Amino acid sequence: APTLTARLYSLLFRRTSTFALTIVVGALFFERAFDQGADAIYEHINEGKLWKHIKHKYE
Amino acid sequence: NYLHATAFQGTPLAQSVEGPSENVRKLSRADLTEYLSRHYKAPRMVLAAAGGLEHRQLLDLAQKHFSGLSGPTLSPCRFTGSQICHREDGLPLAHVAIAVEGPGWAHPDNVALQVANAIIGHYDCTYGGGAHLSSPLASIAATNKLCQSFQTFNICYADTGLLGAHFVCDHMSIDDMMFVLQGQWMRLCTSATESEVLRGKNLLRNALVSHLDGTTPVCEDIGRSLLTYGRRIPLAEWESRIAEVDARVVREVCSKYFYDQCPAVAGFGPIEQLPDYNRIRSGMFWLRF
Amino acid sequence: RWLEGIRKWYYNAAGFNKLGLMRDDTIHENDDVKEAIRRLPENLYNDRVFRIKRALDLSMRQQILPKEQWTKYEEDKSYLEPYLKEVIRERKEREEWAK
Amino acid sequence: RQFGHLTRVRHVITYSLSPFEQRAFPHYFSKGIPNVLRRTRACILRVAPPFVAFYLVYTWGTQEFEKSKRKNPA
Amino acid sequence: TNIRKSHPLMKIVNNAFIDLPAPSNISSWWNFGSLLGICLILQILTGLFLAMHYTSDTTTAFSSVTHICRDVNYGWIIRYMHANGASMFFICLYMHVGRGLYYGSYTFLETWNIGVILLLTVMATAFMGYVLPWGQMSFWGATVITNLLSAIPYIGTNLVEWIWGGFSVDKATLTRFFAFHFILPFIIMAIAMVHLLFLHETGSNNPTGISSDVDKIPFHPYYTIKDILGALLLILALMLLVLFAPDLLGDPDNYTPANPLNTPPHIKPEWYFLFAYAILRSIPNKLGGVLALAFSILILALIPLLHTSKQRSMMFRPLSQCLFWALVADLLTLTWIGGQPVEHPYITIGQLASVLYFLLILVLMPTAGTIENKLLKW
Ligand code: HEM
Ligand code: HEM
Ligand SMILES: CCCCCCCCCCCCO[C@@H]1O[C@H](CO)[C@@H](O[C@H]2O[C@H](CO)[C@@H](O)[C@H](O)[C@H]2O)[C@H](O)[C@H]1O
Ligand SMILES: CC1=NC2=C(CCCC2)C(=O)C1c1ccc(Oc2ccc(OC(F)(F)F)cc2)cc1
């Protein structure tokens, strides 16, 4: 088997058509991942300070 | 010489045939005789002949005079995507030579690459065709007076080679020549047509059938084929390999060697216009296919 | 004479020598200098061309030459002076004649 | 002025590598750090002295304004 | 032949953007042009989006700006991008000018003088922009600065009231300041294009101040990729302000509405005028102070004439280098002093800094050039 970067090239990055479709798929999966991941980091840093954390007290 | 020197840099293929002046001035007779006995050996040699002769007779003559002949492996050569630019504005025309790494003697792809190189072909200012020339590179080059001359090549060595083109042009045309040439490489890679490949096939069929005319070229074909392939490949076999090539083949074969690959560039003379390597390298792909 | 100490100091402080330039490479090209350059013989011109090419390439990398390779103060020939002097001397004659 | 009409150059060779053949950061710390220190040392006592002077005239003037606003023992 | 060199629109783009011959060796100080362009476009977009929500009526004005920040969707991030974007513009401007001074790019006379005009236009724009929120510093800043023109003999007093469209900075002043502030960036964009049109006559200067025709590289990809990196760093600086300290470069008093009675403690313009504000306060006489404030900017037009050195760049010029960095440090002092109340020791420091500003430009740096020449037997 050739290296992982090489497999990525032959499958995704060689044809500019696949290169662009890769970017659009990747952008979706990155967006959701990054947002969810960064929100977690924020809300942990501000545990119990946010309306989201104290919402339960008045419902 | 520059193309090889940069293409196969840091190897024995970078070396010129004639050697540096330093060596010529210093090589003693001891060096020459040592070189001879090391490399001139019966298994690394072929006696070829063509004309009016009985094969049996040649073989017996070989016995008589070449019996005393005695009885060093080549390392592969690393191709490098590189540029050598000898800028010399004092000279009146610019020479540019560009190539990607070719497959080398043995490889069957060479036949398909020859077909592709025949499509693009060659041109100079004394050619009768002009605008009506079949090669788009040639017709564009002729009508716009881009170059004085150009040829595609495919140079074969043992495990490697130089596949590309050389052109000679006006100092203001180098960028345009490169653009049209690289444009042709891309068009064959992505979108070669059946009829133009048929033309290339027909050129190549005609090329190697009429080159082998008279005894000297035939003798040489025997001599060298035995060294490179280990046999003479008959014309009927060449024809079978050529008929096998269609538009799909030319695309797939060209895309292997040309598409998104780092070339070796050599330029000499008034080369101020000769494109920057990055621009040349970006010219090795299309943003569509 | 006595300020030769300071001239030698300034030379190294200025530091164009570190790029392998001579003083006359650093002259700002006005109309006179252009003409002076234009009048240089093949050898002196191509040296100028290379020295600058070398300096620009070094500047591009934000690097200098090895200290051995630096232009020595004493070895800095004033290569452009004879051409430039005469270009100027000529123009001043035309400017005089015009009055 | 287009490329090919800029100026006259003779007998100057330029060798270079493809960006795919080479590294983006060759000897980035190894040669980078010392070159930075050389660059910094070269310009430091041209660049720094006026900002030293600013810092001093600033911190002098600031606490001079403070002392002046205090009452004097008289 | 290609359709980049052929097509009438692409031709201009190909020559001024892609195949442009650029010196191999241009440094980070050459990024500021591109960044000024980004700033201008950034201001225009953010500005236009703000103008969809703002009103120039004196009663509703302050309210509309706050309505943007509280009720309009992402109106806050737009508003503070625009305010800090104005700061980022002026940072970019002074860095861009500094480059020109140090490397002697000002020898490109037309390019340089168009620059001076651009500077003055961005200044006029940003002065009138700061008035639009109609806070205290807005109103009182506009009042003091405008009213300096009354110091002109015979006409001055009329002139001021004609700008105002009344007897104070009021209803007609705010409305027209909105109209002028809207149109001017577009005038800037035009003049900026003429700016480059003259630059592409000569091509770029470089750090050596020695001609670079022998070693030009095409703009693409080398400087397209650098400019992207620069743009990225500009966005970082901007967003670091916008998202972590949006109030840092402004003033608090511009969060209380404009009151024609109640004067703020230490009335001052925004930071990027402070240097010239300090120069104004140095001279005891008012008309003198105005003519000094005006000459503190216009002197830029005089710089090329003051050039004495036989070398173009300061790269190879130690004495000039120091004097240049002194001039920078002095400007930093004038900015500090501009922000201070008029008292001891800030009056005397201010006087001494203003003396040194004009002394550096008109006497010391010219002398230093000629001393450097005579040290090189020139
Ligand atoms: C909105 C304001 C401005 C914009 C958009 C602008 C734009 C540009 C751009 C894009 C460049 C080329 C890239 C560069 O070298 O930075 C440039 C160069 C230049 N600008 Fe500006 N500029 C502005 C203001 C000014 C000012 C205020 C001055 C001087 C007072 C000035 C003088 C110059 C000079 C001299 C150059 C040539 C630099 C060189 O080749 O070394 N510009 N400008
Ligand atoms: C060189 C370009 C520009 C500069 C330097 C600039 C500068 C400024 C400044 C400093 C403010 C006050 C910001 C604050 O304290 O809130 C402002 C406000 C404003 N600007 Fe601009 N501006 C520019 C272009 C534009 C354009 C093109 C428009 C509209 C098409 C615009 C519309 C506004 C509006 C509506 C306000 C009031 C809202 C606010 O205070 O943020 N500006 N401008
Ligand atoms: C005894 C040792 C002295 C060394 C230390 C110096 C600081 C001690 C204070 C001494 C006085 C300093 O002098 C200080 O200068 C400034 C600026 O000129 C004065 O300011 C005054 O003079 C200037 C003169 O042009 C006028 O334009 C201005 O209208 C006026 O306010 C202060 O009112 C004064 O107090
Ligand atoms: C047009 C340009 N010319 C040059 C250099 C340096 C090197 C040589 C000359 C540049 O960086 C350069 C440039 C200028 C601006 C760039 O982005 C823009 C930003 C704004 C813009 O709009 C406008 F017109 F300026 F208002 C147009 C372009 C990108 C590149």
Query: Main sheet of chain C?
Result: none
Which compounds are bound in this model? protoporphyrin IX containing FE, dodecyl-beta-D-maltoside, the ligand CC1=NC2=C(CCCC2)C(=O)C1c1ccc(Oc2ccc(OC(F)(F)F)cc2)cc1
Shape of chain E: globular
- Please give the number of β-strands of chain E: 2
Tally of separate helices of chain E: 13
Helix proportion of chain E:
55-70%
Helix and strand element order of chain C: HHHH
Domain count of chain E: the total is: 1
Q: How many discrete domains of chain C?
A: 1
The total count of helices of chain C amounts to 4
Form type of chain C: globular
Largest interface: C-E, 25 and 27 residues
Strand order of the largest sheet of chain E: 1-2
The helix content of chain C is 55-70%
Proportion of strand residues of chain E: under 5%
- According to DSSP, the number of beta strands of chain C is 0
Alpha-beta classification of chain E = mainly alpha
Radius of gyration of chain C: 16 Å
PDB class: membrane protein
Keywords: Cytochrome bc1, Malaria
Entry title: Crystal structure of bovine cytochrome bc1 in complex with tetrahydro-quinolone inhibitor JAG021
Chain A: Cytochrome b-c1 complex subunit 9
Report on this structure.
This is part of a larger assembly, with chains A (59 residues), B (289 residues), C (99 residues), D (74 residues) and E (378 residues). Chain B has helices spanning 2-7, 21-26, 29-39, 55-66, 109-120, 136-143, 174-191, 194-211, 215-228, 235-244, 247-257, 277-282, and strands spanning 82-88, 94-102, 122-124, 147-152, 155-156, 161-169, 264-269. Chain B is an alpha+beta fold. Chain B has one domain (82-285). In chain B, strands 1, 2, 3, 4, 5, 6 and 7 form a 7-stranded mixed β-sheet that branches. In chain B, a hairpin with a 4-residue loop joins strand 5 and strand 6 (161-169). The longest helix of chain B is centred in the middle third of the chain and has 18 residues, at 174-191. Chain D has one domain (1-74). Helix content of chain E is 65%, strand content 2%. Chain E has a two-stranded antiparallel ribbon with strand order 1-2. Chain E is globular, with a radius of gyration of 22 Å. The chains are: A mainly alpha (59), B alpha+beta (289), C mainly alpha (99), D mainly alpha (74), E mainly alpha (378). Chains in contact: A-B, B-D, B-E, C-D, C-E, D-E. Bound molecules: protoporphyrin IX containing FE (2 copies), dodecyl-beta-D-maltoside (LMT) and the ligand CC1=NC2=C(CCCC2)C(=O)C1c1ccc(Oc2ccc(OC(F)(F)F)cc2)cc1. It is classed as membrane protein. Keywords: Cytochrome bc1, Malaria, Electron transport, membrane protein.
